[PDB]
């Protein structure tokens, strides 16, 4: 019944020699086991399906129809992710989309609007993100403004944790897949944006492999 990891990162996270996934993000280690997020992020992770688009292909055996599911999962504290999976059965498609959304989550950072008092409440800068022909930009807002946007991006942002923000979209917002991918790309670049606050030189902490090789050389052969 106990989870059996595949890669050695799974061994490290299961053996409790690691403390958090923040340094996992810091070292940009790819994640392949979807249960690592479950181990780290517990019952605070909530998922909600967006829409079901039945894609239909035609062959000599007549029309062939299968379903592709869009779901967004992430705790309400800074981690958000999106998943897309297509399967013959709708239920298995939902499960696959949930697994893929759990596998890929990007932490987001929040900032202040002028008066740097309290906890962060809004996007630090005017981030942007474009995929296909959908362009979504996020603008910081003062406290209590809320999330002014379409229902789906509002749901995604409030799932992420950014309570105050201004939005502006352009293109075919009807296509939910492209619009959701664009608003995820816009929110996934909030960390990857050099701010004069982070001009300090970075000290290179030793990689987890270089420090726990003495254990990984004897756990798995």
């Amino acid at each position: 019944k106990e989870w059996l990891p595949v890669t050695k990162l799974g061994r490290l996270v299961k053996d409790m020699k690691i403390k958090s996934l923040e340094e996992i993000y810091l070292f940009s280690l790819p994640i392949k086991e979807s249960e690592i997020i479950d181990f780290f992020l517990g019952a605070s992770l909530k998922d909600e399906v967006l829409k079901i688009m039945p894609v239909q292909k035609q062959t000599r055996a007549g029309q062939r129809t299968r379903f592709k599911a869009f779901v967004a999962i992430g705790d309400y504290n800074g981690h958000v992710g999106l998943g897309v999976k297509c399967s013959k059965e709708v239920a298995t498609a939902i499960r696959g989309a949930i697994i893929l959304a759990k596998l890929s989550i990007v932490p987001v950072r929040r900032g202040y609007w002028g008066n740097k008092i309290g906890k962060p409440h809004t996007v630090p800068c005017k981030v942007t993100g474009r995929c296909g022909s959908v362009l979504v930009r996020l603008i910081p807002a003062p406290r209590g403004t809320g999330i002014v946007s379409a229902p789906v991006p509002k749901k995604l942002l409030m799932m992420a944790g950014i309570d105050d923000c201004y939005t502006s979209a352009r293109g075919c917002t009807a296509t939910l897949g492209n619009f959701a991918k664009a608003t995820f790309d816009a929110i996934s670049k909030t960390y990857s944006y050099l701010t004069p606050d982070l001009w300090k030189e970075t000290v290179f902490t030793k990689s987890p492999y270089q420090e726990f090789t003495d254990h990984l050389v004897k756990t798995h052969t």
Binding site: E23, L26, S28, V106, S192, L194, T202, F204, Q210
Partner: protein
């Protein structure tokens, strides 16, 4: 980031390329953290300490990672000045 007191609200500080001075994102698998070991001058031996480098994925993708590593090793004092 700061506040009334001075504590930090950013939940993690990201890395930063030692060559292009560009930070490394979470979902950037092309980034490389390279470790280079130095050699004692007395005889030539491994001591135990090392020097750590970091190169963003863009530099390697464009193809200038080796030159950046060479420059870093020359500046630190590994590669001979005359070369």
């Amino acid at each position: 980031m700061q506040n009334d007191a001075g504590e930090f609200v950013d939940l993690y500080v990201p890395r930063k390329c030692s060559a292009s001075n560009r930070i490394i994102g979470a979902k950037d698998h092309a980034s490389i953290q390279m470790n280079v070991a130095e050699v004692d001058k007395v005889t030539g031996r491994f001591n135990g300490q090392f020097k750590t480098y970091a190169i963003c994925g863009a530099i390697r993708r464009m193809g200038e990672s080796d030159d950046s590593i060479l420059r870093l090793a020359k500046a630190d004092g590994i590669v001979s000045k005359n070369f």
